[PDB]
Design an enzyme around this catalytic site. Structure first.
Site, PDB file in Angstrom:
ATOM      1  N   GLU A   1     -21.223-123.122  40.524  1.00 12.66           N
ATOM      2  CA  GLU A   1     -21.277-121.722  40.135  1.00 12.66           C
ATOM      3  C   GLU A   1     -20.617-121.558  38.773  1.00 12.66           C
ATOM      4  O   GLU A   1     -21.101-120.816  37.922  1.00 12.66           O
ATOM      5  CB  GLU A   1     -20.556-120.851  41.172  1.00 12.66           C
ATOM      6  CG  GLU A   1     -20.641-119.359  40.896  1.00 12.66           C
ATOM      7  CD  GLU A   1     -20.290-118.526  42.110  1.00 12.66           C
ATOM      8  OE1 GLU A   1     -19.088-118.286  42.363  1.00 12.66           O
ATOM      9  OE2 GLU A   1     -21.226-118.118  42.823  1.00 12.66           O
ATOM     10  N   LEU A   2     -19.504-122.252  38.569  1.00 13.27           N
ATOM     11  CA  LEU A   2     -18.799-122.166  37.298  1.00 13.27           C
ATOM     12  C   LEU A   2     -19.674-122.716  36.171  1.00 13.27           C
ATOM     13  O   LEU A   2     -19.674-122.185  35.061  1.00 13.27           O
ATOM     14  CB  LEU A   2     -17.479-122.936  37.365  1.00 13.27           C
ATOM     15  CG  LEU A   2     -16.622-122.871  36.095  1.00 13.27           C
ATOM     16  CD1 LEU A   2     -16.317-121.416  35.738  1.00 13.27           C
ATOM     17  CD2 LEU A   2     -15.342-123.650  36.316  1.00 13.27           C
TER      18      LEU A   2
END
Ligand SMILES: [As]
Length: 151
Positions: free
Chosen positions: A63-64
């Site tokens: 996600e990062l």
């Protein structure tokens, strides 16, 4: 567009505590925010709460990376929140992140691991905030900052 704030966090660490307070305050100031349960492209801001076990999750790291790849092309503004971890630990994957990455290294593509490290390194260089002696004050600053920053 559809969301003023996208919340990225490790549920296990902060969902029921810090995140419940931050979300409440954001909704209160009428800030449209998204947080999954147990739209990054459509979110204007990404408040990323990197906690002790955030990097332990490959999913959180994915996600990062998604967020940072969008930030690089100006598709989103990222607001880092170092919660219980020093920014330099995130920058070099030291401190608690070392052991978490040793695990990742033994079960993921080496280049993918490097991609994760790149996102963390770049993330730690953005202007952000660290958890301190009062989470309530940190929450107020975040809401105030976004509140005075939204169109
Ligand atoms: As800081």
């Amino acid at each position: 567009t559809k969301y003023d704030v996208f919340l990225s966090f490790r549920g296990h660490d902060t969902r029921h505590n810090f995140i419940s307070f931050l979300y409440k305050e954001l909704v209160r100031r009428s800030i449209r925010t998204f947080k999954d349960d147990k739209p990054i492209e459509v979110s204007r801001f990404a408040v990323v709460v990197v906690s002790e076990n955030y990097a332990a999750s490959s999913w959180c790291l994915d996600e990062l990376v998604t967020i940072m790849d969008f930030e690089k092309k100006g598709s989103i503004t990222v607001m880092p929140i170092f919660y219980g971890v020093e920014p330099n630990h995130v920058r070099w994957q030291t401190g608690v992140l070392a052991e978490q990455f040793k695990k990742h290294a033994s079960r993921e593509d080496p280049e993918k691991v490097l991609k994760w490290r790149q996102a963390l390194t770049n993330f730690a260089q953005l202007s952000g905030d660290c958890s301190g002696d009062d989470d309530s004050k940190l929450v107020d600053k975040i809401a105030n900052e976004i509140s005075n920053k939204k169109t």
